[PDB]
Symmetry: C4
Subunit: 386 residues, 4 copies
Amino acid sequence: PTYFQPRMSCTGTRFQPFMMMNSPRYGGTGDRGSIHLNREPFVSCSMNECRHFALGHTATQNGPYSAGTGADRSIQRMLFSTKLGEPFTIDNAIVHMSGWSGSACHDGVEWTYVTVFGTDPDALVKTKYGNNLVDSYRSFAGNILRTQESECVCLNGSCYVMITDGYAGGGGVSQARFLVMKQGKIIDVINTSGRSKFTEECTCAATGNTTIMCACRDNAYTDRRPIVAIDTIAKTANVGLMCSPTRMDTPRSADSAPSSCNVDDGTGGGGVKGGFAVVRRPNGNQFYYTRTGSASSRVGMEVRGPQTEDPMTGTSAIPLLDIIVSTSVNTGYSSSFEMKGIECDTPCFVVEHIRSNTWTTASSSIYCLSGDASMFQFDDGVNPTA
Amino acid sequence: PTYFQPRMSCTGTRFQPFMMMNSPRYGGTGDRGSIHLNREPFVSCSMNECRHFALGHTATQNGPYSAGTGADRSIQRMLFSTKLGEPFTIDNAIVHMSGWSGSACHDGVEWTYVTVFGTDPDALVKTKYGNNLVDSYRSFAGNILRTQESECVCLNGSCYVMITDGYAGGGGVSQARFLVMKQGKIIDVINTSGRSKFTEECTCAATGNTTIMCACRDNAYTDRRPIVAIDTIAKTANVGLMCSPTRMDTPRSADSAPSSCNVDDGTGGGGVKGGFAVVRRPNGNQFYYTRTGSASSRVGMEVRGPQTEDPMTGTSAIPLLDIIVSTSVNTGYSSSFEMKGIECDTPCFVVEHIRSNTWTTASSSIYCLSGDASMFQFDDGVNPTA
Amino acid sequence: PTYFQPRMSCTGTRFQPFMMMNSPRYGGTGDRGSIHLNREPFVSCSMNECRHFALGHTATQNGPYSAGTGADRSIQRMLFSTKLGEPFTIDNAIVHMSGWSGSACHDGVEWTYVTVFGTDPDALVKTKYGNNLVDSYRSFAGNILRTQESECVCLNGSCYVMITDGYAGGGGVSQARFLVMKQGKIIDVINTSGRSKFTEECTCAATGNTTIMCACRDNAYTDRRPIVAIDTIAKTANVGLMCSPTRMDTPRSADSAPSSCNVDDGTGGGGVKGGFAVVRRPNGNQFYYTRTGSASSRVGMEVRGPQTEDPMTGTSAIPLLDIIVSTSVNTGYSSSFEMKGIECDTPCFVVEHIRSNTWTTASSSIYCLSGDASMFQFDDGVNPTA
Amino acid sequence: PTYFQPRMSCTGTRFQPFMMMNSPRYGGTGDRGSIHLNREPFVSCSMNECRHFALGHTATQNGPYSAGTGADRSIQRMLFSTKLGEPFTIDNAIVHMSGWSGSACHDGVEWTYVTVFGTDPDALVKTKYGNNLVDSYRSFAGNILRTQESECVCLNGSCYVMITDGYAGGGGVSQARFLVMKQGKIIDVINTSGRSKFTEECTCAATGNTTIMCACRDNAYTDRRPIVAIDTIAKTANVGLMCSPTRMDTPRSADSAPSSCNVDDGTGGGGVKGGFAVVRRPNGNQFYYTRTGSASSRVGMEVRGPQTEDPMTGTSAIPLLDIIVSTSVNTGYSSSFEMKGIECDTPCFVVEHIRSNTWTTASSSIYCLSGDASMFQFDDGVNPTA
Ligand SMILES: *[C@@H]1O[C@H](CO)[C@@H](O)[C@H](O)[C@H]1NC(C)=O
Ligand SMILES: *[C@@H]1O[C@H](CO)[C@@H](O)[C@H](O)[C@H]1NC(C)=O
Ligand SMILES: *[C@@H]1O[C@H](CO)[C@@H](O)[C@H](O)[C@H]1NC(C)=O
Ligand SMILES: *[C@@H]1O[C@H](CO)[C@@H](O)[C@H](O)[C@H]1NC(C)=O
């Protein structure tokens, strides 16, 4: 009835610091806070509220169960969120469902949540709409089934969420599929084509009505991100590697043009989830990317400036816009979301900060498209031994 | 005006792990949480929210009053709940009324709460609707008056809650009655017939408009659960023992057919509240049951697959569907609830986990009907000496 | 527009235990809770929610400022409340305004709050409506200005709150006035007549449309409570002493008839706020009273049964209905409130329990009109040295 | 659609104690609370709720990060608020955006938030409306960009917020500008005229429809506050110094008339944000001011009585109304806000109290226009070493 449709983005040229959800700063052995242990934070917004989602380990930052929370998958993993702006404490967190992998988005009416939970070789995808469980999808490759770990994209009520299934190591194949949900019910599945061989942890944004574009991870063959062009009328997802000389993954080789756009050329396997933002304008879209600062290590964070060429076939270099996190500060996964205002959408990037001692926590820094001003780089301010 | 009526259930063949309300995992002597001490958790849902209900002891998990909270009845017992997904902490819990036994349900308009509180030989049932106390019912057998300890069933505004009163030991008689409430006011009382001799801790689900079916406990004569068929037009509750060779109580004898359906045959007295779910379909209902894993002890938990025969007179064995809790993990009471979605209902089972040191707490695991996938068995993850 | 008017009470013959807001049971030096230090708790209800109000000392139960919280008046006193059913913790409490004396009620549209704050010889009454400060009233006798410390009574939008001002010791005069507020604005002041000499801490309930009756304290001359009959059309408050042989204050002499209804006869000064409930029926009102158990000390608590004679001029004894608190448990102030349901009102009594070590706290027990059942007496369960 | 417009103020002659948001009184090394470290608190109100805003340091009152929170600007600074009446704890606080300087107000529909964040020589102003980031404004003088640190004024949807940029020391120039926002979008900028040389930390109140008046700080040349008269139709802000002999800043010289109204005459640089309230009446406006008690030090707090002459050119002395904080209690910044009731507005002053040990916190005392009664002076009651 009132389903959200993408709008043109508002005026701005830089992604300026907006909010820091540095949850594990009100905890520590010398403090009084009770904070969730989690990984892979992301933000999704409705037109009235933004929420900060994460996968927790059902344990406090400084508690008897904090050991063992560095695991990627466990039966204690759950998807939970708070409103953006809340400290992300145990009392403020709302658990949506169990799951060691997941995503969430809002269609303009109600929140849709997607998680993956189960045994590694046979995990199940479950979808929930409005606190009522709606649907499920079974593992298709016989390997760890994974989601975006970021916001899913809703177009007039149809929400497109990426799922993948396959071996994430060298020599593996991980062909992604996009589930199309309406009110949490899976109505369609769009399989990939093009360089479908390995698509993982896709960060997606709308490129206008009827079209979605994603920038994904490749953890086995290259260090150039796959770009997935989803045509929702043709019902096809065309995957290919960025032909740009600027490499967006971590580890990565020195920037250079590929000999051919879809040839595997890089440092080998491994990778990090990255950011991807689209600034939609009446005269064409501009694309922005996040990259770690130091090549070969998840240190620092840069924003690569507007690309006016197709992210797949442009072949031009992507200029540096700003350095948002210095190389003295460790970083993790990067994602993106859009605020949905009264008149326009506002692209924002989310930068993960990883902190550990005898437990592992995540902190997030949100940078939103705004006006031109000198960058004020952010240090998480979390001391694992505080 | 907008009273809820049962709907057909959605597609699914397995009860897959959904959410674990393992409240006493953010507490412990080494943590900073303040968590209620409680027993007999259950979940009830509205179409917009699900709530997790429990009977507390007005004490924290690790506090000066934690001793003595293993009692079944005390004047400090109270009925309280949080939204499903909340940690069930002291600050999130809302107390509804005092009571050492109780149930709750939502009729599509507002929440109805039922508790029993008073002296053992002369306890009083009280009903509340929408935070306003509405009605009461007095003890009828001169013994401990008890409720379902699970969700009550509302049919177009009329909510059916089980109450029982009698000696729970060997040689006792405990004849149940069903109170029919409308807006919390008791409008009718349906007495039982058939094997009315001992009916306790009934887990009820609708079997369609105008009909409710319950699977109850028998703690004195047998190890086969009583099944109560409630005809809301005829205003009769027909009770009889499951004629199936599969015995659902704990302790229980090895599975075997009874010599006659309502003959008392088993290991003697004792028992546990069990689960009972109905999958309503246009071509007939399917019934699902929970059972402990190890016969003679409350260890593990199994889900017994669809029974297409009448739960009372079928006489066929009920196949094993899944083992949801391994026998290395202790379990307690089992119950069931239904989520009420936009298009359909979703049957879910709730499995209690009991943990104690110098206090006693309960944790709950929720398994909801979903798609076919390998089972991922759950270990509560609560260390009484954490 | 939707202002509340009194309704007939529902069926019942006993005030049965309903809820215990024993806030200082989740605190203590061995616990993790942060609970307000307060005195004189009372409950007021809207048709959708009940709230528990108290005057706090802006300090935690076990904190660096807990010393000195036994004071009756200080600049750190504030009026705050939580929803009835909440633990009344620091995080759940909402502060309404500063004040060392106060009352609150709901008119069917929004909450009206009244407090007294200022210097003893020249304190100010302030009224607030809907979080916006509306009006004030200045001290009139040059002595400590006081309120009811209980729910104010709203009749079709006009809310009647008692204020008094005078010396509370022997030989003093404390003539009460009733402020009539509409949307928090003081529209009228009704002065008292009859035995106006000393009226304090009035517990008021409606006796039907256009009429309010209160049972007050007399802390200087007698041990019989003043009864105030407020005629809202005549705009008069007629005060006189209960002519009944049953004495409701503490300390009190042995029950005996007075030689004349308004002659000062008793144990001298001192007193306690008491309960007063009205069961409105089509054939006349019934009155119920609370009394301490042990005469001469605030120990235990009794409910004195229905009085069908005018509370002022009846002259008959008031029979004992139930003993609600045993004499092994210390008690404090008693008050009353009414729940406002869909069809009827439900009179309820609130019994204060006082606990102290190096701080002073209050706990409250709520007993609501319900069916006939044996009484289950309540022990606060709060250990000052827990 | 429903945008707020100023109303006439209600009856009253004194600003009487209303509420004390003494947040750091439920914390301390001996307590269990987790309270934000912050500075420059202020209150802004909607017609349904009042909120207490502050700039935090993302640290608890008694935690591992409490050192270093006495800084005026840092990357850990954020704007957050709670409802007025809440303890302002970590769990109740909602973070709106990052920022080391800011303001907030409500236009009758939704909350507008303004902050300044960035590097000192090139900071950015950002505006947010309804949890969605809307606009920004860049530094204009090449120096620290600052906001009011108090409520912004909304007239029929147009919200007027003061920003300034310049050197705050001796010999500096700090010319203010007023941004006019509608739904968070900056629609106009009104530059100042008159004694535009140094305008800072303006406390603004409406003087009627189409007009706003502010009393500002001057931290370099004088100890008389600048008054800014904003004509929203002429779109001009006329700045000049108070010609009154009563000096409102701190430090200040002994009261005396200036030789000429806009001649710099005082004790030199330095200053404190002060209060400014307007009582709008059909026969003209009255102005009220706050002043510290002890000249030359931020000790105590006085309210200077109604000024019926133009605050700029009156030249008469402003009589003392009340002493609201004694000189035994240290004070900080003062501001003002208006409650928006059903029929009228209610001017209120907010008095900051500064407390520090190894951390710095702020407490606030709210005094609202009410009736005539003897003043009850307030001592914060916060012990830095509690
Ligand atoms: C999508 O379509 C809507 C109208 O249905 C329009 O208002 C909006 O601007 C469009 N967005 C884009 C990005 O084209
Ligand atoms: C109950 O009746 C309603 C119509 O009143 C119908 O929509 C619903 O499907 C029925 N449910 C069952 C289980 O028969
Ligand atoms: C008060 O008047 C209303 C009608 O205005 C009526 O419904 C209600 O029952 C009356 N209450 C009493 C106690 O007479
Ligand atoms: C402002 O104008 C409105 C009508 O638009 C009026 O009701 C209000 O009283 C005016 N306020 C002042 C202060 O003049």
